[PDB]
Amino acid sequence: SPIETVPVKLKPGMDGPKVKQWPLTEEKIKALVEICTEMEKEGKISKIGPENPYNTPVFAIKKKDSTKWRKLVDFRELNKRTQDFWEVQLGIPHPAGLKKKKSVTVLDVGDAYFSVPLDEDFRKYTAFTIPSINNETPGIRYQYNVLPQGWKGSPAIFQSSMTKILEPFKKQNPDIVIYQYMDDLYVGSDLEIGQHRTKIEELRQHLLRWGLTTPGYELHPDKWTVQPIVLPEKDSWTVNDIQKLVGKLNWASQIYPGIKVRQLSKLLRGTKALTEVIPLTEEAELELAENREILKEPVHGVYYDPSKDLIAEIQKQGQGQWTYQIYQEPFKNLKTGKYARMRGAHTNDVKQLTEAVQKITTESIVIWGKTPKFKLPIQKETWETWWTEYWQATWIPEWEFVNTPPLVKLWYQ
Amino acid sequence: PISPIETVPVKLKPGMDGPKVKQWPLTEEKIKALVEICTELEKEGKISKIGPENPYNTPVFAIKKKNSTRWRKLVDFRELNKRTQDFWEVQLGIPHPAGLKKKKSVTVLDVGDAYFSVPLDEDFRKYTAFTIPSINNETPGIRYQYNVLPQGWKGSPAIFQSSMTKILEPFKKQNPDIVIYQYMDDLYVGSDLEIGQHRTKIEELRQHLLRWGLYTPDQKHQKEPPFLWMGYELHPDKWTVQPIVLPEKDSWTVNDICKLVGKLNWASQIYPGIKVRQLSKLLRGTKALTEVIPLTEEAELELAENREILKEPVHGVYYDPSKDLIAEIQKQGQGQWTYQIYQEPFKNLKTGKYARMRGAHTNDVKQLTEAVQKITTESIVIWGKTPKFKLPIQKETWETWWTEYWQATWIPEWEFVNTPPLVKLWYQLEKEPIVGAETFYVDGAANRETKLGKAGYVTNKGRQKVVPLTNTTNQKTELQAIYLALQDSGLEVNIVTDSQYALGIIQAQPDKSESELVNQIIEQLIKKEKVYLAWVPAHKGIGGNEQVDKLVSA
DNA sequence: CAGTCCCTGTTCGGGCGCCAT
DNA sequence: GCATGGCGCCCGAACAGGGACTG
């Protein structure tokens, strides 16, 4: 309804998306038709044909508590091309101190983008197909008129509009910062929770005034503390145990340059038995403590730089627990995280993984405001099959697949 | 006939012109059965002659239909397709008869000459000019443009399929209670109605098309078990594939085996147990289709038994949305998997076959995991639900799997069907070192320019064994060392190596392999009742590994 | 260290199956 | 100088990325 059409300057020679559409279940399939019809009726989306050399897939989500199927467009591929647009020309600043709060809340400002209408030339690129079951009919094809739900350019355009919409709250609460990312608001305060959760419902009305009604959940950045590497301690040190312990102490060598292992390996000289117990010397304990102390303060000489993508790596650990890392350059880690199980009665590797990813992503945005490529400890096939059935977010990260197993009893746990 | 629907704007790839390739000589009989077709078309307005101002030409031929009576006017726009915008296809996975629900009354109708009824884009007709010779090739013949939808364009079906959807849309809104399966110009109609209103609805639909320029000849179903749809036989309660006739010839060529395998794969649908792991093992090698090749003794075994299963007459059943869905899988040959999907104890919906080597060193459960995800991502396509499974695996066999494994995995609701062979993880490494076992320190090395190398070990009780190597690889040498330690050791072993590579493959606890050496390493592993294996830095001051590295010198 | 070699695993193209034009 | 589109199977060519060795 408002304004005019913003011109999207795409990279020269660069062509748009061409991702095929991947089969869906009746649950999401039936949830999607209508969803589109409603958007078709309200003139948000039009209907197109094969004349369009572009596509992108679509699927239905169903987040917890709410029983409203949200429609998500995997604009995962399209965004990388429009990076010039939503990074340079229309850049949404990131509040340095956003992470330094005692509570932040996730707001779903999705439907608030169907206001402004899309450029006419660029509309071409945003097409999507909706498959029929057992191919009852050739999947119908549609296209977008108004700002899309997922595109990372939607809020780079709405950015002018949104700041004026939050003018009063931001101007009268200097202790409450906010961050807009894709299709989800990020409001973080500092005061008590009971006097915070009320500021949220109060911010919901402010927006509800100009047509936003979408009910999020609590999360505090102060709860997050670093977990380095713990060098086990025992009374009886078998050769076998000293073998592994040097291994772990060797990887540490690449991260911390002050790691010494010589003195320690000197007591293994000569082919010895494996179970055979060995007593620790004076110079060995002068290092066992030397290393256990140097393994406290993060790696000196490492800073953040937005000039390079963000990379995330996860390693299973068992019991349903998982552990991950977040770095810019190999071995120059940024955050050394850890993930706990959601408790019992939910013994599922895939579900926890998808959960871990979101729980990592969220902290990527919050903290810096980018999204990391996930080296995912799972098979391309084993994931592409249920990575939706357990997804509950309005954002999709870039990722890859690692298959290499841990070496020395996992260098972390 | 033409002009009922709107023309889709098609453009030529930017920078390029149109097709300027001469028409090649044709069979003398074809021309007289072709010109006889071009005039009937110009008569109905499908085509129109042009002048010399049109410098575009594109070869054309002809071929009898699936009947042998009527012919088919085919054009070769291979040089155009390279110049026509890259459309996006709208057609997806073909429909399947096991996904059909039972309807009290059903009929299917077909459109005659369907491509020749959709108006082609206006300013694009100028690039579809074909030149037809006379009769004796004395004087140049006629040259008309494909005023209508061509037959060999770049995305011809994409436009038709799309247009066919828009024409049926209005009829779907008024009648959203009846079933409609539109594949090309062939559509399957049917509902739980009655003869009276049904036939009226059929006439209602025929006349709906008739007005849209879609004439349907009296070539529609007659409402009997003999229902020709998508190449099958849709009976009222059962269903079978196209009466399949397997080719049998004394000698076979690379091509003649291809025409069999694919024909055999098609029968994997309703027919259970059909495999071709070996039959295809002959397709290996950069072969030419005409090249003659004799069947292997194992290959002649499959082809002989498969020839007997096809002799057996079988039928599938239709889907019921109220009842539960169970897919039962079982293992067959080496790296072979066949599965039957059903809902009634004996009536199957669609059987299958999974046979792939996902990696150099797999495993039986590792293959079974993927043999499950292949049926899932194919069961979702037919029905929007992931079915329950009847797997031949013990619940403790799986539990131990994903608990000691690194790459996350998982399988849906499954039970344990006790049908041999039952998949099991044979051997198992020990988490902790063993006491009273010889501590083999194994390592290997190889030269990059000579390709030869020494691989060996040493122990705690003084045990040394190093041998040479003709043409091995540094990484391969390390693997050899591990092999030695399994021949020169008792039921209890302790092994430590400097190579993750080496560590890796074992850690995963594999069954099959394609390295011969590794396929052998397991043979031992299976027997040794308690094994432990540790790792250690390569070029490090570590003890034990210090000396065996020194031993593989020169 | 930048440069090579191995080894694995994914992606592409080519021919066949079947459906339809 | 013998066509299009879709899905499927199978197979070797090409491409990719990670670890270990080398002047």
Short mmCIF file of C-alpha atoms in Angstrom, two decimals, chain B residues 154-425:
data_model
loop_
_atom_site.label_atom_id
_atom_site.label_comp_id
_atom_site.label_asym_id
_atom_site.label_seq_id
_atom_site.Cartn_x
_atom_site.Cartn_y
_atom_site.Cartn_z
CA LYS B 154 13.14 -26.34 -26.09
CA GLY B 155 10.36 -26.33 -23.51
CA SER B 156 7.26 -27.20 -25.53
CA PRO B 157 5.64 -29.31 -22.79
CA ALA B 158 6.24 -26.63 -20.16
CA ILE B 159 3.95 -24.19 -21.96
CA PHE B 160 1.26 -26.77 -22.74
CA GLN B 161 1.24 -28.24 -19.23
CA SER B 162 0.95 -24.73 -17.79
CA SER B 163 -1.83 -23.64 -20.14
CA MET B 164 -3.67 -26.88 -19.44
CA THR B 165 -3.69 -25.98 -15.76
CA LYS B 166 -5.27 -22.61 -16.25
CA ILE B 167 -8.02 -24.12 -18.42
CA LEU B 168 -8.89 -26.68 -15.80
CA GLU B 169 -8.76 -24.23 -12.92
CA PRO B 170 -12.34 -22.82 -13.36
CA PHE B 171 -13.71 -26.36 -13.52
CA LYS B 172 -11.88 -27.25 -10.31
CA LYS B 173 -13.45 -24.36 -8.37
CA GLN B 174 -17.02 -25.37 -9.33
CA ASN B 175 -16.07 -29.02 -8.80
CA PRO B 176 -13.50 -29.30 -6.05
CA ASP B 177 -15.02 -32.61 -4.94
CA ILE B 178 -14.00 -34.66 -8.01
CA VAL B 179 -10.47 -36.12 -8.69
CA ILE B 180 -8.44 -34.81 -11.61
CA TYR B 181 -5.01 -36.15 -12.66
CA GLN B 182 -3.71 -34.06 -15.50
CA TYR B 183 -0.44 -35.43 -16.99
CA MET B 184 0.09 -33.70 -20.36
CA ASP B 185 -3.09 -34.07 -22.42
CA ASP B 186 -4.03 -37.22 -20.54
CA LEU B 187 -6.30 -36.73 -17.52
CA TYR B 188 -7.77 -39.15 -14.99
CA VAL B 189 -11.27 -38.28 -13.79
CA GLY B 190 -13.36 -39.93 -11.12
CA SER B 191 -15.39 -39.63 -7.92
CA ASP B 192 -17.68 -41.53 -5.48
CA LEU B 193 -20.72 -40.40 -7.45
CA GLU B 194 -23.13 -42.36 -9.64
CA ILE B 195 -23.46 -43.28 -13.30
CA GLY B 196 -26.06 -40.59 -14.02
CA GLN B 197 -24.45 -37.40 -12.69
CA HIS B 198 -20.98 -38.81 -13.42
CA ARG B 199 -21.52 -39.22 -17.16
CA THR B 200 -23.16 -35.78 -17.11
CA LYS B 201 -20.12 -34.35 -15.43
CA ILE B 202 -17.98 -36.04 -18.09
CA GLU B 203 -20.07 -34.42 -20.82
CA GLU B 204 -19.85 -31.26 -18.76
CA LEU B 205 -16.08 -31.47 -18.87
CA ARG B 206 -15.81 -32.52 -22.53
CA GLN B 207 -17.96 -29.55 -23.53
CA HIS B 208 -15.89 -27.38 -21.16
CA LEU B 209 -12.83 -28.27 -23.14
CA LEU B 210 -14.60 -28.28 -26.44
CA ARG B 211 -15.29 -24.56 -25.85
CA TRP B 212 -11.65 -24.09 -24.88
CA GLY B 213 -10.54 -25.61 -28.18
CA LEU B 214 -9.80 -29.02 -26.69
CA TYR B 215 -11.63 -31.60 -28.81
CA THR B 216 -11.75 -35.07 -27.25
CA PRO B 217 -12.49 -37.94 -29.65
CA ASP B 218 -14.57 -40.94 -28.59
CA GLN B 219 -11.30 -42.46 -27.37
CA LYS B 220 -12.17 -42.25 -23.67
CA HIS B 221 -12.32 -45.09 -21.14
CA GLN B 222 -15.34 -47.40 -21.33
CA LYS B 223 -15.47 -48.00 -17.57
CA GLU B 224 -13.95 -51.46 -17.29
CA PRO B 225 -11.01 -53.05 -15.48
CA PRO B 226 -9.06 -52.56 -18.72
CA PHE B 227 -7.97 -48.98 -18.04
CA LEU B 228 -4.95 -47.71 -19.98
CA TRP B 229 -3.51 -44.93 -17.83
CA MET B 230 0.16 -43.90 -17.72
CA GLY B 231 1.02 -47.31 -19.13
CA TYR B 232 -0.72 -49.60 -16.67
CA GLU B 233 -3.93 -51.52 -16.11
CA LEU B 234 -6.18 -49.90 -13.53
CA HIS B 235 -8.68 -52.52 -12.43
CA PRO B 236 -11.47 -51.47 -10.02
CA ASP B 237 -9.71 -52.98 -6.96
CA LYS B 238 -6.33 -54.07 -8.30
CA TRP B 239 -3.69 -52.67 -10.65
CA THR B 240 -0.86 -53.98 -12.84
CA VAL B 241 1.83 -52.59 -15.07
CA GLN B 242 1.94 -52.53 -18.85
CA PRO B 243 2.03 -56.20 -20.01
CA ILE B 244 5.83 -56.39 -20.04
CA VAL B 245 7.70 -58.42 -22.70
CA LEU B 246 11.37 -59.03 -21.81
CA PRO B 247 13.77 -59.23 -24.81
CA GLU B 248 15.57 -62.57 -25.28
CA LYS B 249 18.37 -62.98 -27.81
CA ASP B 250 21.28 -65.41 -28.19
CA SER B 251 23.94 -62.69 -28.24
CA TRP B 252 23.83 -59.33 -26.47
CA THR B 253 25.46 -55.92 -26.97
CA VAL B 254 26.17 -53.09 -24.53
CA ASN B 255 23.03 -51.38 -25.93
CA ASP B 256 20.88 -54.53 -25.82
CA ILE B 257 21.66 -54.96 -22.14
CA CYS B 258 20.71 -51.33 -21.48
CA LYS B 259 17.33 -51.90 -23.11
CA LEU B 260 16.91 -54.72 -20.65
CA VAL B 261 18.10 -53.28 -17.39
CA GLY B 262 15.83 -50.27 -17.73
CA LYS B 263 13.02 -52.56 -18.68
CA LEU B 264 13.80 -54.65 -15.65
CA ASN B 265 13.93 -51.65 -13.35
CA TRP B 266 10.44 -50.64 -14.49
CA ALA B 267 9.18 -53.95 -13.15
CA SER B 268 10.73 -53.29 -9.72
CA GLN B 269 7.47 -51.47 -8.95
CA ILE B 270 4.99 -54.23 -8.47
CA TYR B 271 7.49 -57.16 -8.78
CA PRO B 272 9.47 -57.88 -5.54
CA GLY B 273 13.01 -59.22 -5.23
CA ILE B 274 14.07 -58.16 -8.77
CA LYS B 275 17.77 -57.26 -8.68
CA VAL B 276 20.51 -56.34 -11.16
CA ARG B 277 23.66 -55.78 -9.11
CA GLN B 278 25.64 -58.20 -11.29
CA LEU B 279 23.69 -57.85 -14.54
CA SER B 280 24.93 -54.25 -14.49
CA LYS B 281 28.41 -55.11 -13.25
CA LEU B 282 29.02 -55.62 -16.97
CA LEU B 283 28.26 -52.00 -17.84
CA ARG B 284 31.59 -51.04 -16.28
CA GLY B 285 34.12 -49.60 -18.72
CA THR B 286 33.99 -46.88 -21.39
CA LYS B 287 31.86 -49.08 -23.73
CA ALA B 288 30.22 -48.37 -27.11
CA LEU B 289 26.56 -49.40 -27.41
CA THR B 290 27.01 -51.64 -30.45
CA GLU B 291 29.99 -53.52 -28.91
CA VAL B 292 29.23 -57.24 -28.39
CA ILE B 293 29.79 -58.62 -24.93
CA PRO B 294 29.20 -62.14 -23.49
CA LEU B 295 27.20 -62.59 -20.28
CA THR B 296 29.03 -63.54 -17.07
CA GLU B 297 28.17 -66.79 -15.32
CA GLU B 298 26.65 -64.77 -12.39
CA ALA B 299 24.88 -62.46 -14.83
CA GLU B 300 23.27 -65.39 -16.64
CA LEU B 301 21.99 -66.52 -13.24
CA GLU B 302 20.03 -63.35 -12.49
CA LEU B 303 18.60 -63.01 -15.99
CA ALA B 304 17.41 -66.58 -15.78
CA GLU B 305 15.68 -66.20 -12.41
CA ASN B 306 14.30 -62.76 -13.19
CA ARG B 307 12.81 -64.27 -16.31
CA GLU B 308 10.74 -66.52 -14.07
CA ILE B 309 9.46 -63.90 -11.64
CA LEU B 310 8.01 -61.91 -14.54
CA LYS B 311 6.21 -65.08 -15.61
CA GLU B 312 4.37 -64.94 -12.26
CA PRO B 313 1.19 -62.78 -12.48
CA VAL B 314 0.73 -60.16 -9.73
CA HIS B 315 -1.29 -57.07 -8.81
CA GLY B 316 -1.03 -54.08 -6.47
CA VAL B 317 -3.59 -52.37 -4.28
CA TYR B 318 -4.97 -48.83 -3.87
CA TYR B 319 -4.23 -46.39 -1.07
CA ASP B 320 -6.59 -45.89 1.90
CA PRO B 321 -6.10 -42.69 3.92
CA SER B 322 -7.66 -44.09 7.08
CA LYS B 323 -5.36 -47.09 7.54
CA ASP B 324 -1.75 -47.01 8.78
CA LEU B 325 1.19 -47.21 6.37
CA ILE B 326 4.03 -49.73 6.79
CA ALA B 327 7.11 -50.19 4.59
CA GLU B 328 8.88 -53.55 5.06
CA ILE B 329 12.50 -53.80 3.97
CA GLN B 330 14.86 -56.76 3.77
CA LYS B 331 18.40 -57.51 2.68
CA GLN B 332 19.11 -59.72 -0.33
CA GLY B 333 22.51 -60.05 -1.98
CA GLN B 334 25.82 -58.29 -1.37
CA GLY B 335 24.99 -54.59 -1.27
CA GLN B 336 21.45 -55.46 -2.43
CA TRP B 337 18.16 -54.31 -0.90
CA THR B 338 14.56 -54.99 -1.89
CA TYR B 339 11.49 -53.59 -0.07
CA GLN B 340 7.77 -54.02 -0.23
CA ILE B 341 5.45 -51.21 0.99
CA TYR B 342 1.95 -52.21 2.16
CA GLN B 343 -0.94 -51.51 4.48
CA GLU B 344 -2.92 -54.76 4.34
CA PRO B 345 -0.96 -57.85 5.45
CA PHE B 346 -0.74 -59.27 1.90
CA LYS B 347 -1.75 -56.50 -0.51
CA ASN B 348 1.29 -54.44 -1.50
CA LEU B 349 1.20 -50.90 -2.78
CA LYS B 350 4.57 -50.69 -4.54
CA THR B 351 7.72 -52.81 -4.11
CA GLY B 352 11.21 -51.42 -4.55
CA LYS B 353 14.97 -51.86 -4.95
CA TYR B 354 17.89 -49.98 -3.45
CA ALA B 355 21.44 -50.84 -4.58
CA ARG B 356 24.22 -48.27 -4.19
CA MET B 357 27.75 -48.05 -2.84
CA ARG B 358 27.64 -44.85 -0.84
CA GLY B 359 31.37 -44.67 -0.23
CA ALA B 360 34.43 -46.92 -0.36
CA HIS B 361 33.95 -48.61 3.02
CA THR B 362 30.29 -48.88 4.08
CA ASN B 363 28.40 -51.09 6.49
CA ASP B 364 25.14 -53.05 6.58
CA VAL B 365 23.29 -50.67 8.94
CA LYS B 366 24.95 -47.71 7.28
CA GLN B 367 23.44 -48.88 4.04
CA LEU B 368 20.15 -49.63 5.75
CA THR B 369 19.96 -46.11 7.12
CA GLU B 370 20.14 -44.77 3.55
CA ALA B 371 17.97 -47.53 2.27
CA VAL B 372 15.38 -46.09 4.63
CA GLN B 373 15.85 -42.46 3.66
CA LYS B 374 15.43 -43.45 0.02
CA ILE B 375 12.04 -44.94 0.65
CA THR B 376 11.01 -41.99 2.85
CA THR B 377 11.90 -39.22 0.42
CA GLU B 378 9.88 -41.21 -2.10
CA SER B 379 6.96 -42.02 0.12
CA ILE B 380 6.52 -38.37 0.89
CA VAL B 381 6.24 -37.71 -2.87
CA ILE B 382 3.35 -40.16 -3.25
CA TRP B 383 1.71 -39.53 0.11
CA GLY B 384 2.41 -36.67 2.52
CA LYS B 385 3.36 -38.95 5.40
CA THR B 386 6.45 -40.92 6.39
CA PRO B 387 5.32 -44.58 7.00
CA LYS B 388 6.11 -47.05 9.76
CA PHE B 389 8.94 -49.58 9.11
CA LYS B 390 9.43 -53.35 9.52
CA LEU B 391 13.21 -53.55 9.63
CA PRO B 392 15.24 -56.76 10.11
CA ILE B 393 17.34 -55.37 12.98
CA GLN B 394 17.45 -55.91 16.75
CA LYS B 395 16.66 -52.85 18.83
CA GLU B 396 19.97 -53.26 20.74
CA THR B 397 21.86 -53.48 17.47
CA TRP B 398 20.71 -50.02 16.54
CA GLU B 399 20.90 -48.50 19.98
CA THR B 400 24.62 -49.33 20.16
CA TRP B 401 25.10 -47.79 16.76
CA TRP B 402 24.21 -44.13 17.11
CA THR B 403 25.63 -43.97 20.58
CA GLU B 404 29.23 -44.76 19.64
CA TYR B 405 29.04 -42.97 16.28
CA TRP B 406 30.00 -39.39 15.39
CA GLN B 407 27.83 -38.40 12.43
CA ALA B 408 24.26 -38.04 13.73
CA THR B 409 21.66 -40.46 12.41
CA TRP B 410 18.17 -41.70 13.03
CA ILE B 411 15.29 -43.84 11.74
CA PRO B 412 11.46 -43.39 12.35
CA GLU B 413 9.00 -45.80 13.95
CA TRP B 414 10.40 -49.25 13.26
CA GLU B 415 9.98 -52.73 14.60
CA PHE B 416 12.08 -55.88 14.31
CA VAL B 417 10.90 -58.26 11.65
CA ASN B 418 12.78 -61.57 12.06
CA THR B 419 13.50 -62.42 8.40
CA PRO B 420 16.96 -63.75 7.34
CA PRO B 421 19.27 -62.32 6.71
CA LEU B 422 19.01 -60.12 9.80
CA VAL B 423 21.42 -57.17 9.63
CA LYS B 424 23.94 -57.04 12.48
CA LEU B 425 27.08 -55.11 13.31
#
